């Protein structure tokens, strides 16, 4: 195992913009790869303007259209990151809903009720469990942490640009932008809170974190590693589900 010096990096996580199915409350996991609606494109543009002076260092997106288009909407309006290479990662994809993909939410709830279970725990045929989704979050996050530590090893500005628009000892090694999906995000955020014991702002309830993700809702975390080998990070949640770009 590799020895690293102390390190800190920022992680901004943004849900994709609205699609036709989001508007109509139709389940959308890994079914139809539906693009943004015109409202979704507007939200992505607004988010891009909100973030235009942020100096991101890395960009990752789910390999679904709705997230790819949102990432595009954001980067095309960036002062510094227009030309940034986006990495597309299937680990960031939405929870699978199997045979209820493309059905009304009410059909999933009825199926749950019939199974003597409750949503979101209930998993339909062909769908993923909450723990399976979280495991994809853990996998991606560990991947990201190793990536950043190794890059820092192989080699104010980032923090100041974040502090401009977000409620904020080693200078930030990186500022990562991730565009993903509501259920996946909720499970990742649950990993950060329940498992990594992340700190929460005074304005953020535990209930917010576990249910609730608006289209283009933004969350910022600072990830902190002490020096050493195989170090468990600590996490500070700066904001969650920010929608200041939408009013």
UniProtKB/Swiss-Prot annotation:
Localisation per UniProt entry: Cytoplasm; Nucleus; Mitochondrion
Reactions it catalyzes: beta-D-fructose 2,6-bisphosphate + H2O = beta-D-fructose 6-phosphate + phosphate
Induction, as annotated: Up-regulated by p53/TP53 (at protein level). Rapidly up-regulated by p53/TP53. Up-regulated in glioma cell line in a p53/TP53-independent manner.
Summary of subunit composition and partner proteins: Interacts with HK2; the interaction increases hexokinase HK2 activity in a hypoxia- and HIF1A-dependent manner, resulting in the regulation of mitochondrial membrane potential, thus increasing NADPH production and decreasing intracellular ROS levels.
Predominant place of localization: cytoplasm
First and last residue of the signal peptide: none
CDD domains associated with the record: HP_PGM_like
Function comment: Fructose-bisphosphatase hydrolyzing fructose-2,6-bisphosphate as well as fructose-1,6-bisphosphate. Acts as a negative regulator of glycolysis by lowering intracellular levels of fructose-2,6-bisphosphate in a p53/TP53-dependent manner, resulting in the pentose phosphate pathway (PPP) activation and NADPH production. Contributes to the generation of reduced glutathione to cause a decrease in intracellular reactive oxygen species (ROS) content, correlating with its ability to protect cells from oxidative or metabolic stress-induced cell death.
Record key words, sorted: Acetylation, Apoptosis, Autophagy, Cytoplasm, Hydrolase, Mitochondrion, Nucleus
Name of the top EC class for this enzyme: hydrolase
Organism: Homo sapiens (Human)
GO CC annotation, single: mitochondrial outer membrane
Tissue: Expressed in the brain. Expressed in breast tumors. Expressed in glioblastomas.
A Pfam family reported for this protein in Swiss-Prot or TrEMBL: His_Phos_1
SMART domains: PGAM
Homology family: Belongs to the phosphoglycerate mutase family.
Residue positions, PTM N6-acetyllysine: 55
Highest taxon, organism lineage: Eukaryota
Active-site residues per Swiss-Prot or TrEMBL entry: 16, 94
EC numbers, comma separated: 3.1.3.46
Stated name of the protein: Fructose-2,6-bisphosphatase TIGAR
Outcome reported for the amino acid change (mutating residue 181 to A): Abolishes the ability to lower cellular fructose-2,6-bisphosphate levels, to inhibit the glycolytic activity, to reduce levels of ROS, to increase oxygen consumption and to protect toward hypoxic cell death
Any one Gene Ontology molecular-function term assigned to this protein's record: fructose-2,6-bisphosphate 2-phosphatase activity
